[PDB]
Design a binder for this molecule. Structure first.
Ligand code: HEM
Length: 153
């Protein structure tokens, strides 16, 4: 599992995310959409945005970034005891939203990219390994729930 020392690395940088949840949400979602355009087509709410400036100017997009980060945070502060938290999320993402596991890999990479950009003194290799570990545990757990439900395995 993550060691206590790994968990402290993850939560130290996540407390700096919290100082600007909206801004980090925006940057994470923009990166995802520009690097992996197919992901934007999942969002009836956002599929009209074509350019990076249009994405930056959308207030609703910045709201959904907060939604996302606020749920991610709540999961992380459980330190792996996130069964309750995860269960509604994998349920909607398998059945309603239909989000492949691979696209959760891609938002994982955009999280780490942004955190590197924003927090390089608090996001050395040590903390980057720890963050990667904690995002891989989130994906493993959700993947287990998708399998159970019979969504892309
Ligand atoms: C850190 C990873 C992610 C977290 C914590 C997250 C969290 C959430 C939450 C809390 C909601 C609203 C409640 C719900 O319907 O469950 C939501 C909705 C949604 N998410 Fe996720 N999500 C993540 C990744 C993704 C990815 C990678 C995509 C697409 C590529 C996606 C697509 C959606 C869509 C389409 C909605 C509904 C938005 C709307 O129409 O209101 N999510 N997400």
């Amino acid at each position: 599992v993550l060691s206590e020392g790994e968990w402290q690395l993850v939560l130290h940088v996540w407390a700096k995310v919290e100082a600007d949840v909206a801004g980090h949400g925006q940057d994470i979602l923009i990166r995802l959409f520009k690097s992996h355009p197919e992901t934007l087509e999942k969002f009836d709410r956002f599929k009209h945005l074509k350019t990076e400036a249009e994405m930056k100017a959308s207030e609703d997009l910045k709201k959904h970034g907060v939604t996302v980060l606020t749920a991610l945070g709540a999961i992380l502060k459980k330190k792996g005891h996130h069964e309750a938290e995860l269960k509604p999320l994998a349920q909607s993402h398998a059945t309603k939203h239909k989000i492949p596991i691979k696209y959760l890999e891609f938002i994982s990479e955009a999280i780490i990219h942004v955190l590197h950009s924003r927090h390089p003194g608090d996001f050395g290799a040590d903390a980057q390994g720890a963050m990667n570990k904690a995002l891989e545990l989130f994906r493993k757990d959700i993947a287990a729930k998708y399998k159970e439900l019979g969504y892309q395995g």
